[PDB]
Subunit: 295 residues, 4 copies
Amino acid sequence: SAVKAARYGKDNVRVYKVHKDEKTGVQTVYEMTVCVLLEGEIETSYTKADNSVIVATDSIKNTIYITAKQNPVTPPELFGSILGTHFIEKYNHIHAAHVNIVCHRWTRMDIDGKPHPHSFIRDSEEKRNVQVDVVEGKGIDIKSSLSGLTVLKSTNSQFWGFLRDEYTTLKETWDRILSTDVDATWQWKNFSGLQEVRSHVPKFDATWATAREVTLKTFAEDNSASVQATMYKMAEQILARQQLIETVEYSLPNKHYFEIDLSWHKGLQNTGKNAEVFAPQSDPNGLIKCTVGRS
Amino acid sequence: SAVKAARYGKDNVRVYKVHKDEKTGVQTVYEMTVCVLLEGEIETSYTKADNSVIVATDSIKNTIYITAKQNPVTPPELFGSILGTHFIEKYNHIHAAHVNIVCHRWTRMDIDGKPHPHSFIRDSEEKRNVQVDVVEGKGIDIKSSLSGLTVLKSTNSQFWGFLRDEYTTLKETWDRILSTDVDATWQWKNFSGLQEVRSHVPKFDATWATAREVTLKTFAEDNSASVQATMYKMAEQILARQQLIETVEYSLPNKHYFEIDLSWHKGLQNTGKNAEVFAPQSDPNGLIKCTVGRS
Amino acid sequence: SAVKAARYGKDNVRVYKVHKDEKTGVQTVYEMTVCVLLEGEIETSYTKADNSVIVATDSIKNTIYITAKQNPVTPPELFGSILGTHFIEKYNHIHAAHVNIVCHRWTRMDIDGKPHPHSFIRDSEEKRNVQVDVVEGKGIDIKSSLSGLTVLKSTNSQFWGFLRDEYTTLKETWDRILSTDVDATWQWKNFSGLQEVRSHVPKFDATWATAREVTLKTFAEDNSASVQATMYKMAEQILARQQLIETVEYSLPNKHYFEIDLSWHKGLQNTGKNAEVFAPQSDPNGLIKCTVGRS
Amino acid sequence: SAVKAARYGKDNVRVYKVHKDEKTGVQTVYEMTVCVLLEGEIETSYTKADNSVIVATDSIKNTIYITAKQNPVTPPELFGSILGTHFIEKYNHIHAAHVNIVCHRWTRMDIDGKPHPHSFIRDSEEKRNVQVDVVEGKGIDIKSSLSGLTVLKSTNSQFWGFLRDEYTTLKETWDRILSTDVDATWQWKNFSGLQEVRSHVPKFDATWATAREVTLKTFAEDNSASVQATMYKMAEQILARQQLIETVEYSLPNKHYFEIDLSWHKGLQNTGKNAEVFAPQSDPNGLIKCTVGRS
Ligand SMILES: O=c1[nH]c(=O)c2nn[nH]c2[nH]1
Ligand SMILES: O=c1[nH]c(=O)c2nn[nH]c2[nH]1
Ligand SMILES: O=c1[nH]c(=O)c2nn[nH]c2[nH]1
Ligand SMILES: O=c1[nH]c(=O)c2nn[nH]c2[nH]1
Ligand SMILES: O=c1[nH]c(=O)c2nn[nH]c2[nH]1
Ligand SMILES: O=c1[nH]c(=O)c2nn[nH]c2[nH]1
Ligand SMILES: O=c1[nH]c(=O)c2nn[nH]c2[nH]1
Ligand SMILES: O=c1[nH]c(=O)c2nn[nH]c2[nH]1
Ligand SMILES: [Ar]
Ligand SMILES: [Ar]
Ligand SMILES: [Ar]
Ligand SMILES: [Ar]
Ligand SMILES: [Ar]
Ligand SMILES: [Ar]
Ligand SMILES: [Ar]
Ligand SMILES: [Ar]
Ligand code: NA
Ligand code: NA
Ligand code: NA
Ligand code: NA
C-alpha cells in the first residue's frame, strides 16, 4: 500500500474582523468561515508515525487568525491567495494550500432612513464563496461563487415538448411556478501568483456583483423554456461581461410546487388557470447542472 | 389510568397561495407552514379504539388547503382564526383548535430599480408566526411573533457591575460586540370570536411592523447595559404603541464573539482598543428572557 | 410597564466527563448538553441597568463544569438536582434554577465479541433528557424523557372507522406501515429537596429503562387501531410500573409512507396486497399527543 | 459560449421497499434516497430551447420506483448498476447515468430476546452509500462508502513531535481523546457492464462489512500516533482483504475535546492525569484525508 493522495488542515474556522474609520466613526464588519488544507511531502505522517512533517491543524488555525489581523479579509479571493501563498512559501515541504472561504452577510441597518454606523443585519442566508488553490510552481487557481440565493417566480416559466414514453406521466405546461436555490460558480484564468492576483483586485467584487445581477435579471425576465435554457442564458451573459473568467457553472434544484385538485370538494376550482393554492414539495427535486465556456 | 390531556392533528403542512391582479398584471405570493391540532371529546380514540371521534389528520390537511382557497391567507392571525373557527363550528365534539402558522419570506425583486410583477427572493430565514387558539366558549387567543432576525452591533454594548465571586472569571467591559437572534412575541387581548377578529384586521400587520421596527432601532441605538436592559426597552415601547396587546415577550441568545490574544506572535496587538479580529463562538450562548406587561 | 416574568442563564453548554477505574482499566464516558436558567429578584437588571443582581451567564457556565468535576454526572436527574440546588442555596436572591440536560449516546464498542475498555460509538441520535426545576420553598420538580427514538413496523397497523364527511379522502385500511419518532416524558412526584432525590437514585435509570422497553415492545406487538390507541397502552403500562411517576406524556408524529400506483406502467401491481415499494413522505405528518395520569 | 459539461436528473428520491416471506412470515424493510443524473446529447436543451432531448426528471423519478418494483434493491451497488444500465440502453442519446444511493438503517428489533418479524429501529444515523457511474462503452464505475459512523476513544491516542515554530501553541500530548465521524470509501475495479457486476454480488455486502469491522477494530485498538497514522492502517487492511478494490479513501474530522483548567477555582485539579471534565469543541475541527492504493 502507498499513499496516492493526502491533504490535511483545519476546517470550520470562524472569523470576524471589524474595521473602524477615523474621520467618519463608521464601522464595517466581515465574517467568514475558513478551511485550509495542505499538500506536500507528508506521506510519512501516514506511513511511519512521523509527525515531524506535520504543521499542526492547531497552528494552521492560529495562522488564519494572524493572517486576518495582518491583512484586509476582503475580497475573499485576495485573502485566500495571501493565506494560501503563506503556506507554500513558509514551509519547504508543503507544495499546495487549498483555501475555502464562505462569507456571511452582515448588511448595515438603515435606521429612520439613514445607514447606522455600527449595526448590521444578516439579511439573507445567501453566501459568497471562494475556493483558492495555491500550488507551488503552478500558480493560484480561483473559483468564486454565490450560493443559497433562493428565488421563486409565480408565472412565465414553461415546460413542454419533452420526451414522452411508457415512463412518462408528467403533463406538459405553458405556465408553472419556478423556484430554485442558485449555486453559480465562475472559474478565473489561472494567476501566476500573489502579485498577479493583486493586479486584479477590483474585478473580484465587480464580477460577483455582475454574476448576481445577471442571475436575478435573467431569472425574473426570461420566459423560461426550461431550467436548462434559463441557466444557459445567465452563464452566457456572465462570460460576456468578464474576460478573466474561463468557465461559469450553475447547479439548480427544481423546487417543485404541485397544483392541488380540489374539485372533489364542492366542485372547487383550483387547477389550470384557476390554480391559486399549491403544495410545495420538499422532495424529490429536479437537479439541473451546466458548465459553459468560450467557443 | 385516564387521559388527562390530548390533542392531535396535522403538522408541517406547506401551503403556497398566489394572488393575480388582472388589471395590473401584478402577482403576489404567500407561503406558510401550518399545524392544526384539535381537542375535544376524543378520549375514547385513545382508550377504546373508537376512531369515530377522529377527524382524520389527512382530512385536517385537506381542510387547510380548502380554507386557503376560500379565504385570504393574510394576515396569518386572521387566517388562523378562520381555520380554527371552522373546526369548532363544524364538529360538535371538537372544543378547541390550535393553529400554528409560520410565514416564509418572498420579497418582490427589484430589477433595474422597478419592482418585478412576479419574481421574488427569500431575503433571510426570518419568520413571522402566529399561534391561534380557538376555544369553544372562550373566544380566540392569539400570540404573534417574529423569529430568526439575526443582528450584530460592533460597538456600544457594555457589561460591567455584575456579581463577582469564586465562580466568576468574566472580565468587566465597556465596549464589546452584541449579537442575537430575535424571538419576540406579542399576546393579544382575548377576542370574542371571528367577528371581532375581522374587525381589527389592520392592527395585525401594523403591530408586526411596529414590533420589528422598535426591535431594530432600539438594538441599533441603545448603548446597552446588558441584554436584559435593552430587551426591556424594546418591550416597553411595543406595549405603549398598541393598546390591544397585553404582553410582549423576548427570548434572546447572547451570541458571543471572543477577543483573540495574538501577543504571543510577533507582539501582535489584538485586544482591548486594538481588537479587530474575533472568534465567533457557536456554543455555549447566554440566553435571556423577559415577559413585560402593563403595571 | 413591569417585568411579569424573567429568567436567564447559559444555554448549549457541552460537557464530557470520563471515569477511569484504576483496578480494571475500564473507562466510561458521559457527554451531555446543559442549559441553566435562573429566576429571582433580578427585575432591576431589566428595569434599572442593575447588573449587581446578575450571576453572569459566563459564571453559570463555569459553575456547570465545576459541579460536573465535583459530582457524578449520572443519572441526569441527580446531576440536575445538585446543580439547581447549588444556585438557590449559594445566592440569596435567586429563587429558582431551571436545569435542562440532554444526554448523548456513547455505547461501549464490542471488538471481537468483548467490550473494549475505552472505545465508544454513537449508536443513533436518540437522547435521554431531564428538566429539573429547583424552586426555593417548593422542592424539586423533575421531568425525564427519551426522544429521537425512530421506529417503523411494516405491518400490524390499521386505521379504519374514522369520521368521514365532505372533507375526507383518506381510504380506510386494515394493513399499513406505522413509523414514528418517539418523544416520551414521565413527570416525577415533587421531591422535598436534594436529600430526598438522592434517596431514590436507582429509580431514575430503571424508570428510563422501563419506559424504553415498554415503548419498543408495545409498538412491536400491538396490532394498532390508531397511533392514539397504541400510545395510550404504552403510557398505562409505564405508570403501572413505577409508583413515583405521576404522569406519562407521549408526542408521536405519524411518518406517512404512501402506496405508489404503478398500474399505468406495464400493468405493474403495487397496491393493497401487492404493495412492496412505497414513497416515504417527509411532510406533512400526523401529530398525536396524550398525557396519561392515574384515575 | 458552448456547453462544456451538463447533467440533469432527479435528486432526493426517497424509496422504501418491503419483502414478505412465505414460509416464515418474516418481513424485511429497505429504505434509501436516490439521485440519478444523466449525460449525453442534451446540449440543445440548454442552447436552443429544445426539450425534445429531455427525459423528464419526473420520468426519471417514476423510473426509479418502477425499477425498485422490478428488482431487489440490495445490495445498492447492484441496484444502482441495474438502474444506471437502464438509462443508457433505453435512450439512444443518453451516454451516461450517475446513480447515488444513500441507504438508511432499519434494524430488526429484538423483543424479549427474540427478533421481531416486522418491527425495526433506526439504530444509527450512519449511512451506507454508493456512487454508480454507468458510462456507455466505458463500463460501470462503482465507489462504495460508509459515512456518519461517529466514534470516540477516551485514551490511547497521542500527538507529539509535530513542527514547532512561531505559529505553534499546541502542546504535545501522550494521552488525549480522539473522536471522529468516519467517512470511508472503496473504489472497485471498473466493471465491463451489468453482467460483470452480477458475477460479484456477494462481495458488495462482504466488503462493506469488512470495511466497517476494520475501521472499528483499528480505531479501538491502535495506540494512535496521529489521525494520519490510524487512518492509514485501516486502509492498508481493507485493500489487503479484497482484491477487487483499487483504492481506499478516508476523510476524518478531528473532533476536539479540550481540557478545562479549573485550578483558578479552589485549586481544583482537572488537567493532565487529573483531567476528568472536558469541553467538546463544536468548531473548528482538524480535517485529515488520505487515498491509499496498491504499490
Ligand atoms: O492527529 C492529529 N493530526 C494533526 O495533523 C493534528 N494537528 N493538530 N492536532 C492534530 N492531531
Ligand atoms: O401535480 C403534480 N405535478 C407533477 O409534476 C407531478 N409529478 N408527480 N406527481 C405530480 N403531481
Ligand atoms: O448582557 C449580558 N447579560 C448577562 O446576563 C451576561 N452574563 N454574562 N455576560 C452577559 N451579558
Ligand atoms: O475572550 C473570552 N471572553 C469571555 O467572555 C470568555 N469566557 N470564557 N472564555 C472567554 N474568553
Ligand atoms: O393513527 C392515526 N391517527 C389519526 O388520527 C389519523 N388520521 N389520519 N391517519 C391517522 N392515523
Ligand atoms: O397514498 C396515499 N395515501 C394517503 O393517505 C394520502 N393522503 N394524501 N395523499 C395520499 N396518498
Ligand atoms: O425545467 C425543467 N427541466 C427538466 O429537465 C424537467 N423535468 N421535469 N420537469 C422539468 N423542468
Ligand atoms: O485546551 C486546549 N487545547 C488545544 O489543543 C487548544 N488549541 N487552541 N486552544 C486550545 N485549548
Ligand atoms: Ar473575517
Ligand atoms: Ar433556472
Ligand atoms: Ar400561503
Ligand atoms: Ar439586545
Ligand atoms: Ar457529562
Ligand atoms: Ar404508536
Ligand atoms: Ar428501497
Ligand atoms: Ar483516526
Ligand atoms: Na513550499
Ligand atoms: Na365544537
Ligand atoms: Na436563594
Ligand atoms: Na444510450
